[PDB]
Design an enzyme around this catalytic site. Structure first.
Site, PDB file in Angstrom:
ATOM      1  N   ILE A  19       0.825  -1.160   0.222  1.00  0.00           N
ATOM      2  CA  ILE A  19      -0.201  -0.103  -0.100  1.00  0.00           C
ATOM      3  C   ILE A  19       0.974   1.300  -0.029  1.00  0.00           C
ATOM      4  O   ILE A  19       0.446   2.438  -0.255  1.00  0.00           O
ATOM      5  CB  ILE A  19      -1.069   0.179   1.357  1.00  0.00           C
ATOM      6  CG1 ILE A  19      -0.153   0.079   2.574  1.00  0.00           C
ATOM      7  CG2 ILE A  19      -2.013  -1.223   1.008  1.00  0.00           C
ATOM      8  CD1 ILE A  19      -1.129  -0.152   3.616  1.00  0.00           C
ATOM      9  N   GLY A  20       2.024   1.149   0.267  1.00  0.00           N
ATOM     10  CA  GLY A  20       2.856   2.282   0.272  1.00  0.00           C
ATOM     11  C   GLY A  20       4.207   2.277   0.880  1.00  0.00           C
ATOM     12  O   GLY A  20       4.556   1.206   1.833  1.00  0.00           O
ATOM     13  N   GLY A  25      11.069   0.860   5.746  1.00  0.00           N
ATOM     14  CA  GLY A  25      10.606  -0.257   4.879  1.00  0.00           C
ATOM     15  C   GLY A  25       9.387   0.051   3.918  1.00  0.00           C
ATOM     16  O   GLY A  25       9.092   1.189   3.705  1.00  0.00           O
ATOM     17  N   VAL A  27       5.043  -0.897   3.494  1.00  0.00           N
ATOM     18  CA  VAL A  27       3.921  -1.221   4.241  1.00  0.00           C
ATOM     19  C   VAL A  27       2.888  -2.032   3.379  1.00  0.00           C
ATOM     20  O   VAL A  27       2.640  -1.538   2.209  1.00  0.00           O
ATOM     21  CB  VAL A  27       3.133   0.017   4.725  1.00  0.00           C
ATOM     22  CG1 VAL A  27       1.964  -0.389   5.638  1.00  0.00           C
ATOM     23  CG2 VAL A  27       3.993   0.899   5.319  1.00  0.00           C
ATOM     24  N   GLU A  89      -3.355  -1.137  13.030  1.00  0.00           N
ATOM     25  CA  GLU A  89      -4.556  -0.942  12.203  1.00  0.00           C
ATOM     26  C   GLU A  89      -4.261  -0.272  10.801  1.00  0.00           C
ATOM     27  O   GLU A  89      -3.442   0.622  10.711  1.00  0.00           O
ATOM     28  CB  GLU A  89      -5.804  -0.177  13.110  1.00  0.00           C
ATOM     29  CG  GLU A  89      -5.503   1.285  13.056  1.00  0.00           C
ATOM     30  CD  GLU A  89      -6.752   1.948  14.042  1.00  0.00           C
ATOM     31  OE1 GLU A  89      -7.709   2.106  13.769  1.00  0.00           O
ATOM     32  OE2 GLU A  89      -6.252   2.723  15.041  1.00  0.00           O
ATOM     33  N   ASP A 133       6.995  14.765  14.800  1.00  0.00           N
ATOM     34  CA  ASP A 133       6.780  14.727  13.329  1.00  0.00           C
ATOM     35  C   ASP A 133       5.395  14.899  12.906  1.00  0.00           C
ATOM     36  O   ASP A 133       5.040  14.550  11.917  1.00  0.00           O
ATOM     37  CB  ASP A 133       7.297  13.506  12.680  1.00  0.00           C
ATOM     38  CG  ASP A 133       7.725  13.748  11.264  1.00  0.00           C
ATOM     39  OD1 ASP A 133       7.983  14.746  10.831  1.00  0.00           O
ATOM     40  OD2 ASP A 133       7.990  12.689  10.522  1.00  0.00           O
ATOM     41  N   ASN A 138       1.260  12.620   8.367  1.00  0.00           N
ATOM     42  CA  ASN A 138       1.308  11.581   9.389  1.00  0.00           C
ATOM     43  C   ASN A 138      -0.237  11.691  10.261  1.00  0.00           C
ATOM     44  O   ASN A 138      -0.027  11.105  11.158  1.00  0.00           O
ATOM     45  CB  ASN A 138       2.401  11.982  10.372  1.00  0.00           C
ATOM     46  CG  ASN A 138       3.751  11.540   9.927  1.00  0.00           C
ATOM     47  OD1 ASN A 138       3.856  10.638   9.007  1.00  0.00           O
ATOM     48  ND2 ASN A 138       4.917  12.386  10.202  1.00  0.00           N
TER      49      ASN A 138
HETATM   50  N1  LIG Z   1      -1.923   2.381   9.339  1.00  0.00           N
HETATM   51  C1  LIG Z   1      -2.055   2.872   8.090  1.00  0.00           C
HETATM   52  N2  LIG Z   1      -3.139   2.855   7.388  1.00  0.00           N
HETATM   53  C2  LIG Z   1      -3.027   3.386   6.180  1.00  0.00           C
HETATM   54  N3  LIG Z   1      -3.668   3.415   5.041  1.00  0.00           N
HETATM   55  C3  LIG Z   1      -3.590   4.272   4.066  1.00  0.00           C
HETATM   56  C4  LIG Z   1      -4.605   4.082   3.206  1.00  0.00           C
HETATM   57  C5  LIG Z   1      -4.743   4.547   1.799  1.00  0.00           C
HETATM   58  C6  LIG Z   1      -3.436   5.294   1.346  1.00  0.00           C
HETATM   59  S1  LIG Z   1      -3.285   6.048  -0.160  1.00  0.00           S
HETATM   60  N4  LIG Z   1      -4.068   7.718   0.015  1.00  0.00           N
HETATM   61  O1  LIG Z   1      -4.327   5.240  -1.207  1.00  0.00           O
HETATM   62  O2  LIG Z   1      -1.986   6.174  -0.655  1.00  0.00           O
HETATM   63  C7  LIG Z   1      -2.578   5.326   2.412  1.00  0.00           C
HETATM   64  C8  LIG Z   1      -2.463   4.722   3.597  1.00  0.00           C
HETATM   65  N5  LIG Z   1      -1.467   3.561   6.237  1.00  0.00           N
HETATM   66  N6  LIG Z   1      -0.987   3.280   7.255  1.00  0.00           N
HETATM   67  C9  LIG Z   1       0.114   3.431   7.807  1.00  0.00           C
HETATM   68  O3  LIG Z   1       0.743   3.235   8.619  1.00  0.00           O
HETATM   69  C10 LIG Z   1       1.190   4.292   6.574  1.00  0.00           C
HETATM   70  C11 LIG Z   1       1.488   5.796   7.037  1.00  0.00           C
HETATM   71  F1  LIG Z   1       1.469   6.061   8.456  1.00  0.00           F
HETATM   72  C12 LIG Z   1       2.516   6.213   6.371  1.00  0.00           C
HETATM   73  C13 LIG Z   1       2.752   5.993   5.168  1.00  0.00           C
HETATM   74  C14 LIG Z   1       2.387   4.783   4.583  1.00  0.00           C
HETATM   75  C15 LIG Z   1       1.456   3.834   5.339  1.00  0.00           C
HETATM   76  F2  LIG Z   1       1.060   2.804   4.655  1.00  0.00           F
HETATM   77 MG   LIG Z   2       5.361   9.534   7.804  1.00  0.00          MG
END
Ligand SMILES: Nc1nc(Nc2ccc(S(N)(=O)=O)cc2)nn1C(=O)c1c(F)cccc1F
Ligand SMILES: [Mg+2]
Length: 287
Positions: A19-20, A25, A27, A89, A133, A138
Protein backbone atom coordinates in the site's frame (compact mmCIF):
# COMPACT_ATOMS: atom_id res chain seq x y z
CA UNK A 1 12.29 -3.08 25.32
CA UNK A 2 11.52 -5.96 22.95
CA UNK A 3 9.90 -7.95 25.77
CA UNK A 4 6.66 -8.62 23.93
CA UNK A 5 8.11 -9.45 20.51
CA UNK A 6 6.15 -12.27 18.90
CA UNK A 7 7.02 -14.95 16.34
CA UNK A 8 5.38 -16.64 13.33
CA UNK A 9 3.21 -13.71 12.15
CA UNK A 10 1.68 -15.53 9.16
CA UNK A 11 -0.05 -17.94 11.54
CA UNK A 12 -2.21 -15.03 12.71
CA UNK A 13 -2.08 -12.60 9.77
CA UNK A 14 -2.37 -12.83 6.02
CA UNK A 15 -0.12 -10.51 4.04
CA UNK A 16 -1.81 -8.88 1.06
CA UNK A 17 -0.81 -6.22 -1.47
CA UNK A 18 1.61 -3.31 -0.97
CA UNK A 19 0.00 0.00 0.00
CA UNK A 20 3.02 2.29 0.20
CA UNK A 21 6.49 3.26 1.33
CA UNK A 22 6.73 3.44 5.11
CA UNK A 23 8.81 5.80 7.22
CA UNK A 24 10.88 2.62 7.39
CA UNK A 25 10.53 -0.24 4.88
CA UNK A 26 7.35 -0.91 2.90
CA UNK A 27 3.79 -1.19 4.18
CA UNK A 28 1.38 -3.92 3.11
CA UNK A 29 -2.30 -4.45 3.57
CA UNK A 30 -3.10 -7.55 5.61
CA UNK A 31 -5.85 -9.50 7.39
CA UNK A 32 -6.14 -10.42 11.06
CA UNK A 33 -7.31 -14.01 10.67
CA UNK A 34 -8.91 -13.89 14.14
CA UNK A 35 -11.34 -11.02 13.40
CA UNK A 36 -11.02 -10.61 9.63
CA UNK A 37 -10.23 -6.95 10.20
CA UNK A 38 -7.81 -5.34 7.75
CA UNK A 39 -4.41 -4.34 9.13
CA UNK A 40 -1.31 -2.51 7.92
CA UNK A 41 1.95 -4.44 8.05
CA UNK A 42 5.16 -2.43 7.98
CA UNK A 43 7.95 -4.78 6.92
CA UNK A 44 11.51 -3.84 7.76
CA UNK A 45 14.66 -5.58 6.56
CA UNK A 46 16.73 -5.54 9.77
CA UNK A 47 19.69 -6.72 7.72
CA UNK A 48 19.59 -3.85 5.25
CA UNK A 49 19.55 -1.05 7.82
CA UNK A 50 21.36 -0.65 11.13
CA UNK A 51 21.68 3.06 11.88
CA UNK A 52 17.89 3.22 11.72
CA UNK A 53 17.54 0.30 14.16
CA UNK A 54 17.32 2.62 17.18
CA UNK A 55 14.50 4.54 15.50
CA UNK A 56 12.74 1.29 14.63
CA UNK A 57 13.09 0.18 18.26
CA UNK A 58 11.62 3.49 19.39
CA UNK A 59 8.63 3.24 17.05
CA UNK A 60 7.71 -0.18 18.43
CA UNK A 61 8.21 0.91 22.03
CA UNK A 62 6.10 4.03 21.64
CA UNK A 63 3.35 2.25 19.66
CA UNK A 64 3.20 -0.55 22.21
CA UNK A 65 2.66 1.99 24.99
CA UNK A 66 -0.17 3.88 23.30
CA UNK A 67 -3.83 3.05 23.85
CA UNK A 68 -6.01 5.79 22.32
CA UNK A 69 -8.62 6.07 19.57
CA UNK A 70 -6.51 8.99 18.29
CA UNK A 71 -3.31 6.98 17.81
CA UNK A 72 -2.96 4.12 15.28
CA UNK A 73 -3.78 0.90 17.13
CA UNK A 74 -0.85 -1.45 17.60
CA UNK A 75 -1.27 -5.20 17.14
CA UNK A 76 2.30 -6.29 17.75
CA UNK A 77 5.75 -6.79 16.28
CA UNK A 78 6.87 -10.07 14.77
CA UNK A 79 10.18 -11.53 13.67
CA UNK A 80 10.50 -13.56 10.47
CA UNK A 81 13.92 -14.23 8.88
CA UNK A 82 15.73 -10.85 8.76
CA UNK A 83 12.42 -9.05 8.50
CA UNK A 84 10.54 -7.30 11.26
CA UNK A 85 6.76 -7.08 10.87
CA UNK A 86 5.17 -4.11 12.63
CA UNK A 87 1.40 -4.60 12.56
CA UNK A 88 -1.09 -1.78 13.10
CA UNK A 89 -4.71 -0.97 12.21
CA UNK A 90 -5.36 -0.11 8.59
CA UNK A 91 -7.00 3.25 8.01
CA UNK A 92 -8.84 3.43 4.71
CA UNK A 93 -9.22 7.17 4.20
CA UNK A 94 -5.53 7.88 3.59
CA UNK A 95 -3.63 10.82 5.06
CA UNK A 96 -4.77 14.40 5.51
CA UNK A 97 -2.09 15.34 2.96
CA UNK A 98 -3.63 12.90 0.47
CA UNK A 99 -7.02 14.48 1.08
CA UNK A 100 -5.61 17.91 0.20
CA UNK A 101 -4.56 16.74 -3.28
CA UNK A 102 -7.87 17.35 -5.12
CA UNK A 103 -8.39 20.89 -3.84
CA UNK A 104 -8.85 23.17 -0.84
CA UNK A 105 -10.50 22.39 2.50
CA UNK A 106 -13.13 24.58 4.08
CA UNK A 107 -12.79 25.85 7.65
CA UNK A 108 -15.22 23.27 9.06
CA UNK A 109 -13.03 20.50 7.64
CA UNK A 110 -9.88 22.21 8.92
CA UNK A 111 -11.33 22.66 12.41
CA UNK A 112 -12.64 19.08 12.56
CA UNK A 113 -9.25 17.66 11.61
CA UNK A 114 -7.35 19.97 13.98
CA UNK A 115 -9.68 19.07 16.85
CA UNK A 116 -8.96 15.38 16.44
CA UNK A 117 -5.20 15.99 16.10
CA UNK A 118 -5.44 17.95 19.34
CA UNK A 119 -7.14 15.02 21.10
CA UNK A 120 -4.26 12.84 19.94
CA UNK A 121 -1.72 15.37 21.17
CA UNK A 122 -3.53 15.75 24.49
CA UNK A 123 -3.28 11.98 24.92
CA UNK A 124 0.42 11.78 23.96
CA UNK A 125 1.48 14.77 26.03
CA UNK A 126 -0.39 13.42 29.06
CA UNK A 127 1.76 10.30 28.60
CA UNK A 128 4.89 12.49 28.47
CA UNK A 129 5.37 11.57 24.81
CA UNK A 130 6.25 14.06 22.08
CA UNK A 131 5.41 13.09 18.50
CA UNK A 132 8.02 15.40 16.93
CA UNK A 133 6.87 14.84 13.34
CA UNK A 134 3.39 16.38 13.27
CA UNK A 135 2.38 17.21 9.68
CA UNK A 136 -0.57 16.39 7.42
CA UNK A 137 1.24 13.32 5.98
CA UNK A 138 1.27 11.70 9.44
CA UNK A 139 -2.40 12.31 10.13
CA UNK A 140 -4.45 9.31 8.92
CA UNK A 141 -8.18 8.99 8.45
CA UNK A 142 -10.52 6.01 8.53
CA UNK A 143 -12.86 5.64 5.57
CA UNK A 144 -15.57 7.27 7.67
CA UNK A 145 -13.65 10.22 8.97
CA UNK A 146 -11.97 9.14 12.20
CA UNK A 147 -8.63 10.94 12.54
CA UNK A 148 -5.54 9.31 14.07
CA UNK A 149 -1.86 10.17 14.55
CA UNK A 150 0.73 7.93 12.88
CA UNK A 151 4.49 7.35 12.40
CA UNK A 152 6.16 7.39 15.80
CA UNK A 153 9.68 6.63 14.60
CA UNK A 154 11.13 9.88 15.96
CA UNK A 155 8.84 10.23 18.98
CA UNK A 156 10.41 11.33 22.25
CA UNK A 157 9.70 10.21 25.81
CA UNK A 158 10.09 12.40 28.90
CA UNK A 159 10.87 10.82 32.27
CA UNK A 160 11.60 11.97 35.82
CA UNK A 161 15.30 12.25 34.95
CA UNK A 162 14.80 13.56 31.40
CA UNK A 163 12.34 16.46 31.60
CA UNK A 164 13.35 17.82 28.18
CA UNK A 165 14.64 16.40 24.90
CA UNK A 166 17.24 17.95 22.63
CA UNK A 167 17.48 15.68 19.59
CA UNK A 168 17.43 17.27 16.13
CA UNK A 169 14.49 15.39 14.56
CA UNK A 170 11.39 16.12 12.55
CA UNK A 171 10.70 17.50 9.08
CA UNK A 172 12.32 20.94 8.60
CA UNK A 173 9.30 22.97 7.39
CA UNK A 174 7.35 21.85 10.48
CA UNK A 175 10.14 21.98 13.07
CA UNK A 176 10.00 24.33 16.06
CA UNK A 177 12.84 26.86 16.34
CA UNK A 178 14.02 25.39 19.64
CA UNK A 179 14.26 21.91 18.05
CA UNK A 180 16.34 23.26 15.17
CA UNK A 181 18.60 25.03 17.70
CA UNK A 182 18.72 21.76 19.69
CA UNK A 183 17.77 23.60 22.85
CA UNK A 184 16.08 21.66 25.62
CA UNK A 185 12.46 21.32 24.50
CA UNK A 186 9.25 19.47 25.34
CA UNK A 187 5.69 18.90 24.12
CA UNK A 188 5.41 22.58 23.16
CA UNK A 189 7.49 21.66 20.08
CA UNK A 190 4.47 19.64 18.86
CA UNK A 191 2.27 22.71 19.33
CA UNK A 192 4.46 24.70 16.94
CA UNK A 193 4.30 21.85 14.42
CA UNK A 194 0.51 21.87 14.88
CA UNK A 195 0.50 25.56 13.93
CA UNK A 196 2.44 24.82 10.75
CA UNK A 197 0.04 21.93 10.05
CA UNK A 198 -2.90 24.34 10.43
CA UNK A 199 -1.35 26.56 7.74
CA UNK A 200 -0.75 23.42 5.65
CA UNK A 201 -4.42 22.44 5.95
CA UNK A 202 -5.58 25.96 5.02
CA UNK A 203 -3.11 26.82 2.26
CA UNK A 204 -2.21 23.32 1.09
CA UNK A 205 1.48 23.60 1.97
CA UNK A 206 3.60 24.86 4.88
CA UNK A 207 5.48 28.19 4.89
CA UNK A 208 8.77 28.15 2.89
CA UNK A 209 7.63 25.12 0.86
CA UNK A 210 9.58 26.18 -2.24
CA UNK A 211 12.90 26.48 -0.41
CA UNK A 212 15.62 23.89 0.07
CA UNK A 213 15.20 22.30 3.55
CA UNK A 214 18.70 23.40 4.59
CA UNK A 215 17.75 27.02 3.96
CA UNK A 216 14.71 26.80 6.19
CA UNK A 217 16.93 25.44 8.97
CA UNK A 218 18.36 28.94 9.33
CA UNK A 219 15.21 30.85 8.36
CA UNK A 220 12.95 29.42 11.05
CA UNK A 221 14.98 30.46 14.10
CA UNK A 222 15.83 33.82 12.54
CA UNK A 223 12.57 35.02 11.06
CA UNK A 224 9.50 36.17 12.88
CA UNK A 225 7.04 33.26 13.17
CA UNK A 226 4.78 32.54 10.22
CA UNK A 227 1.26 33.87 10.21
CA UNK A 228 -1.71 32.66 8.22
CA UNK A 229 -2.18 35.06 5.33
CA UNK A 230 -5.25 35.21 3.13
CA UNK A 231 -8.98 35.59 3.52
CA UNK A 232 -9.42 33.21 6.45
CA UNK A 233 -11.52 33.77 9.57
CA UNK A 234 -10.00 35.75 12.42
CA UNK A 235 -10.30 32.79 14.82
CA UNK A 236 -8.33 30.56 12.40
CA UNK A 237 -5.63 33.21 12.08
CA UNK A 238 -5.54 33.57 15.86
CA UNK A 239 -5.31 29.79 16.35
CA UNK A 240 -2.24 29.73 14.12
CA UNK A 241 -0.71 32.76 15.87
CA UNK A 242 -1.22 31.13 19.28
CA UNK A 243 0.68 28.04 18.18
CA UNK A 244 3.43 29.85 16.35
CA UNK A 245 5.03 31.70 19.24
CA UNK A 246 8.85 31.68 19.17
CA UNK A 247 8.87 31.29 22.95
CA UNK A 248 7.62 27.78 23.71
CA UNK A 249 6.27 28.57 27.20
CA UNK A 250 3.89 31.09 25.62
CA UNK A 251 2.33 28.47 23.36
CA UNK A 252 -0.93 26.98 24.66
CA UNK A 253 -1.24 23.32 25.59
CA UNK A 254 -3.27 20.93 23.46
CA UNK A 255 -5.98 20.88 26.16
CA UNK A 256 -6.18 24.67 26.01
CA UNK A 257 -6.42 24.70 22.21
CA UNK A 258 -9.36 22.30 22.32
CA UNK A 259 -11.22 25.27 23.81
CA UNK A 260 -10.10 27.75 21.16
CA UNK A 261 -12.83 29.79 19.48
CA UNK A 262 -11.79 28.44 16.07
CA UNK A 263 -12.33 24.83 17.18
CA UNK A 264 -15.54 25.45 19.14
CA UNK A 265 -17.17 27.48 16.38
CA UNK A 266 -16.22 25.38 13.37
CA UNK A 267 -15.54 21.74 14.30
CA UNK A 268 -18.34 19.28 13.53
CA UNK A 269 -18.76 15.52 13.70
CA UNK A 270 -15.98 13.51 12.08
CA UNK A 271 -18.38 11.57 9.84
CA UNK A 272 -18.79 14.69 7.69
CA UNK A 273 -15.17 14.15 6.63
CA UNK A 274 -16.37 11.20 4.52
CA UNK A 275 -17.15 13.82 1.87
CA UNK A 276 -13.42 14.62 1.75
CA UNK A 277 -12.56 10.96 1.47
CA UNK A 278 -15.10 10.50 -1.35
CA UNK A 279 -13.63 13.54 -3.12
CA UNK A 280 -10.21 11.95 -2.99
CA UNK A 281 -11.48 8.59 -4.26
CA UNK A 282 -13.17 10.29 -7.20
CA UNK A 283 -10.09 12.37 -7.93
CA UNK A 284 -7.68 9.43 -7.69
CA UNK A 285 -9.78 7.28 -10.02
CA UNK A 286 -9.29 9.79 -12.84
CA UNK A 287 -5.60 10.53 -12.38
N1 LIG B 1 -1.95 2.33 9.34
C1 LIG B 1 -2.03 2.81 8.08
N2 LIG B 1 -3.18 2.79 7.40
C2 LIG B 1 -2.91 3.35 6.22
N3 LIG B 1 -3.77 3.54 5.18
C3 LIG B 1 -3.59 4.15 3.98
C4 LIG B 1 -4.69 4.04 3.11
C5 LIG B 1 -4.65 4.62 1.84
C6 LIG B 1 -3.50 5.32 1.44
S1 LIG B 1 -3.48 6.05 -0.16
N4 LIG B 1 -4.19 7.65 -0.02
O1 LIG B 1 -4.36 5.23 -1.21
O2 LIG B 1 -1.96 6.17 -0.66
C7 LIG B 1 -2.39 5.45 2.30
C8 LIG B 1 -2.43 4.86 3.57
N5 LIG B 1 -1.62 3.69 6.20
N6 LIG B 1 -1.06 3.37 7.31
C9 LIG B 1 0.26 3.62 7.60
O3 LIG B 1 0.66 3.18 8.71
C10 LIG B 1 1.15 4.35 6.72
C11 LIG B 1 1.68 5.60 7.14
F1 LIG B 1 1.44 6.11 8.32
C12 LIG B 1 2.52 6.37 6.32
C13 LIG B 1 2.84 5.91 5.03
C14 LIG B 1 2.32 4.69 4.57
C15 LIG B 1 1.48 3.93 5.40
F2 LIG B 1 1.07 2.83 4.86
MG1 LIG C 1 5.28 9.46 7.83
Amino acid sequence: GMQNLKADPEELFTKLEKIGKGSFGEVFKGIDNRTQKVVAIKIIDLEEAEDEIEDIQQEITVLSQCDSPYVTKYYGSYLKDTKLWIIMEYLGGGSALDLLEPGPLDETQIATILREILKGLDYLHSEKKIHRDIKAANVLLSEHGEVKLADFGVAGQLTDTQIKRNTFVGTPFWMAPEVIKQSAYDSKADIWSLGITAIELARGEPPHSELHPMKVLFLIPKNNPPTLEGNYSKPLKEFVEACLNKEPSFRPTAKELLKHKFILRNAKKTSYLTELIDRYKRWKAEQ
